[PDB]
Each structure stands twice: as structure tokens, then as C-alpha cells.
Amino acid sequence: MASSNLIKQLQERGLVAQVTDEEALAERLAQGPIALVCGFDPTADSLHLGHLVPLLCLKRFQQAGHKPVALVGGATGLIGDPSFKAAERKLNTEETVQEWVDKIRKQVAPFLDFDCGENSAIAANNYDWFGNMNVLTFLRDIGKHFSVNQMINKEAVKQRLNREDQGISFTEFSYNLLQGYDFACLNKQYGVVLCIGGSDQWGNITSGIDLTRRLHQNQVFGLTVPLITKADGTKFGKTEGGAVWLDPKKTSPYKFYQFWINTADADVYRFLKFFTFMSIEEINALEEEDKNSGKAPRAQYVLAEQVTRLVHGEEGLQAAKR
Amino acid sequence: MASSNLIKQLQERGLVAQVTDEEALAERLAQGPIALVCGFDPTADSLHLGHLVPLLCLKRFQQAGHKPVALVGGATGLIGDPSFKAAERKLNTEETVQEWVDKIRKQVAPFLDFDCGENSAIAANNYDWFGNMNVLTFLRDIGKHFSVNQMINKEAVKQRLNREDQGISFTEFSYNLLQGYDFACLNKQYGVVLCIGGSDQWGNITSGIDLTRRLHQNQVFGLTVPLITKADGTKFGKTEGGAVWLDPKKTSPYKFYQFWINTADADVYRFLKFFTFMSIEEINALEEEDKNSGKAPRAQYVLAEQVTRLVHGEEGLQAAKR
Ligand SMILES: N[C@@H](Cc1ccc(O)c(I)c1)C(=O)O
Ligand SMILES: N[C@@H](Cc1ccc(O)c(I)c1)C(=O)O
């Protein structure tokens, strides 16, 4: 019964919002390297800061020796995840999502190692299995395992069903089945036994754990990272100018760097934990140092340098100074 | 603004449970012959008495000069209609339903005229369009027009969502979309503007009217026939021996004939109206005659003869006496 401390280490960073059976997950992680998955839906031709914590978290797992599967939702992006959203998401055309899928895949790759040991990353696209799946097969083979009674009290969509000013299409109501089947499929072909996701993904993830159990009798796990918040209560990664994109052509490395310099003192130390690979020891020493220096805090500059390098590499960091 | 009296004539027989915009439907019917549809799901290799009133009602429309489309649910029978049902219907295999589809089509044909004028009958199978429809197309192109909030308060499934001892799979919850799209598709290819169905079909039918409106901007109509009841409160067409089948190999014409002879005095005159083509005038005179004869009622014998001939022809009637 060895027990892995990886979940504890992430908890210490404040990076675990919810986790299924943390005791059993920690024991499984100590048994050896696992394949895990984190996914992103092509809702734009680029990811932005709201996708960064989960993405880096997938990298933290790889660095701990596990194998990351980076899934891009070629099919789920044609449907739209309603989870904790107030209104129906825009339906994009198949041609546009396909192009966005490619853009996101290429943008995600540099963050993971695709050529190292047995823990090399794997790129996945759920369009591989839903793209040509026929409706009767879906409704019967996947659909019979879902109780609508359970689906409607899922927290993620409850509000869309209870408030009047907030309905939900059958299209988005079905999304939970698609993402639940993705977990079963990834477990079947790649041995994925852990799914990590954003704060709003609990219900989608647990539907995947249950369906994996139902379809393959394998126990799998899920973990969500927290909704990143600012002490002043405003929305993180949201500016007058819109989202802060990970694509240098949409948001320049210079502007990306400026966004991090602009971090509030109240948020900066927490943000070093969520967005960088500096040890907890070093971040605490840095906080203590700023507390006693009588100088401007060095933390914003450190945060800006670290995340800008992570996202745009040494070249982006240099472009941030010209 | 001519007005057709066909709906009135059916009302007089006690054959109209609910009808959408009866005034506009009656005017449309007076404009000229229409294409209408009644459908049957392959839940067995034969229809039984519970399907007879709607089937004969399709024939009453044809006799009034309209064109009947007899739809057999090659795809909907792979899903299962939950309407006013207490529990999940059994999922049958594709091979078995396909064989049942053929059996039902052939059994329905003799009841309609496929070779007369411009009002010759048309056989349809929704497997033609759902059989190969891909899931993303279904969820997006059909699914975006359905509000889950509306779907859950449909009377037909409300009980499955409210009672605890009664859940519903996403599989059966989706059925309403399939039958709603069938109406739009039949309106598009055959000009069908009226759907008739059993008593439990109101919600499926209205979903079809709404989706036809949404997809093609055409106003179409629906009508349901009543749940046939017996004065003693027991279930019509249900015996110790099970259902009363329309297939002579499952329920012999002799036994079929005996079932009608066994009709209660309290039900027989109503049953002559629902199950035969005798005029209302003649049925009333027959009731008056039995009231004053001092003889056994002739009505059961007349009912037995008429329905047995309708269902098994002159040959079945003769076999009923040997
Ligand atoms: N619904 C997720 C994106 C996503 C989609 C499919 C999938 O299998 C997985 I793992 C993740 C989100 O919106 O973050
Ligand atoms: N749900 C119906 C059968 C049926 C199925 C599909 C369809 O388009 C039509 I019109 C009728 C019943 O159970 O009676």
C-alpha cells in the first residue's frame, strides 16, 4: 500500500479543487507511471489564460513521471460544453473547428515532451470516434447508461434548467455523454485512468468515471484544478482588450509579459504557485524577501519572466524587452 | 374558407382524443386531398389490437380521399418510445428489428389501397434517414431546436422524471426528437401535413409540428385517437393469453373472431364505431334493435364479423366457423 505524495504536493500549491478518492488515487500513483488526460475544446483558434493552469498541471504530471494525453475536442467543440455557462454556446462550422483543432494541437505540443521515455505525450482528438459514429449507435450503446434524472441535477447544468432566463438545448445537454465516453475510450485504448480538468468539469469527469466503470469495469479517477480568482474579485485573464491568448500572433509576448507584471501584490505569490515550476520553498522565501526588503516586490518580475518563458520560450522573453 | 366535416364525422364516432387547431385543419381538409401519416414501431413481429384503431383511422382518411403514409419505425424501434410507459423498453438487436419491420410492413399493406388514384398509399421507414445519420449531425441539426426544459415537462415522460421508482435513459428521452424529425422529413419529401397517432402520442406529434414549423416554416397538424377502454375498467385487447395479434399465425382468425363475440354489451356499440365502417346511422339502429328485440344482442356477432373480415379477409371469416 505505498502512497504517492503527488496529490499532496499539488494541494500545497492550491492546485486541487476536487479529487475522487484521493487515498486510492495516491496509492495508484505510487504503483507506477500512469497515462492521464487533460482536454481542450476548439472554441477559438487558440487557447487563452483560462486554459493555462490545467495545461501546466498536465505538464506537472509528466514531470512527475506520468504520461500525458492532450486531447483536443474535434467533436465536442462542434457541440459546446454548457458546464456552468449562462447561455448556449455558438455553433461553429465543421470546417472552422477542424482548422482550430489543428491550431490548438500545435500550440499545446511545445508544452509537453513528445520525445522522452515511456512517458512521451500523446495527442488525441475525439473526432476520431465521434466524427463518423452513427446516431442510433450513440443513443443505444452510450445513451442507455445515462439516467436523465441524474443528468438534470448535475450542478454544471442545474441552473440552465431551473432559472427561466436560462434554457439548454438537447445539443448541449448531450455534451456530458460525449465527454463521458471519451474517458472510457481513452481508458480502453491508452490505459488512461486519471482525467484532470478545469473547475467547471467535475460533472463531465465523474460521468466519465461512471461510464468507464459501467463499460469496462475499470476504476478510474478525476481531479479538477481551481477557478483562478483575483483578490479584487474581477475575472482573471480578462482585460478591456478581451482574453489573454497563448498565441503570439493574437497576444504578443510583449503584451503577455506586461499582463504578468501588472499582477496585484495580493495575487502574485498564489500565481507563482499556479503558473510556475518554482518550488514552494522558493516561492515562500521570495514572499518573505519582498516582505522585508523595502523595495518594489520582485515577485511580479519573477512571475512575468517564468510564465512568459513557459509559454513563448526564450525568444518570447527576449521580445518582451523590445 | 370552405370547411371539411371529416373531423366532425370522426368525433361523432368518438375517434378524436385531441386535435391541433381543429378549425384550421378542417379548412385545410376541405381545400383538397392531403398526405397524412400514421406510424407503428416494430416492438414485436406483428401489430396487435392496440394498434388497430389508429390503423383503421388511417384507412378512414384514405376512404375520404386523402393519401395515407404508413410509417414503420425501423430506427425508432431500435430506441423505444417511453410515452406514458412505466419502465424502460427492451432494446432489440438491429437484425431482429429489421426482420420485424418487414413483417409489420407486409401486415399493414392489405389494410390500405396502394393501387387506386392519386391517393395510393405510401410505405415509409425512418431507418431510411436515421440508419446512417451521424451523431454530430443529429445533435446539432436537429438537437439545437429542442429545449430540454420543455422536453422534461412533456406529460408523456413527466412521470418517469418525477417518481423515484421510475427513471428514464437518455436513449428513450431522445425518442421524441427522432419522431419529431420524422414529421419534418415526411412533410419535406411527401408533403405530409397531418400526423395521426395513438392516445399516448400527443407530445411526439406536437414536437413534430413545432420542428416542421422551425425547419420548414410549414404549418402541419396532429390528431390522436383515444385509449380504447372497457366499461369494466380492464385493459382492452389484453387476455390471460396475452395480446390479441393481427397475425393469423400468432392469433388465429378463429380465436380473433371469438374475442369479438366475447364483447360486453356495454362496450359493443362503441366498439362498432371504433372498429368498423358501418355508418353511425346503422350502428344506432342496431343498438335500438337490440334494445327492443327480446333476443340475444346481434351486435357482438356483427362486430365479430366485420372486424374479422377487415383484418383477415373473407378467408379468415370462413376459417372462424371451422
Ligand atoms: N469540456 C472540457 C474540454 C474537454 C472535452 C472533451 C474531453 O474528453 C475532455 I478530457 C475535455 C472543457 O470545456 O474544458
Ligand atoms: N411512437 C409511435 C410510433 C411512431 C414512430 C415514429 C413516427 O414517425 C411515427 I408518425 C409513429 C407509437 O409508439 O405509436
Curated annotation (Swiss-Prot), chains A, B:
Keyword Transferase: no
N6-acetyllysine modified-residue sites: K144
Molecular functions (GO terms): ATP binding; protein homodimerization activity; RNA binding; tyrosine-tRNA ligase activity
UniProt entry tagged with the keyword Protein biosynthesis: yes
Chemical reaction(s) catalysed: tRNA(Tyr) + L-tyrosine + ATP = L-tyrosyl-tRNA(Tyr) + AMP + diphosphate + H(+); D-tyrosine + tRNA(Tyr) + ATP = D-tyrosyl-tRNA(Tyr) + AMP + diphosphate + H(+)
One cellular component (GO) term of this entry: membrane
EC number: 6.1.1.1
Biological process per Gene Ontology, one example term: tRNA aminoacylation
Keywords recorded for this protein, A-Z: Acetylation, Aminoacyl-tRNA synthetase, ATP-binding, Cytoplasm, Ligase, Nucleotide-binding, Protein biosynthesis, RNA-binding
Protein name: Tyrosine--tRNA ligase
Originating organism: Escherichia coli (strain K12)
Higher taxonomy: Bacteria, Pseudomonadati, Pseudomonadota, Gammaproteobacteria, Enterobacterales
Gene: tyrS
Residues of the full protein shown: 1 to 322 of 424
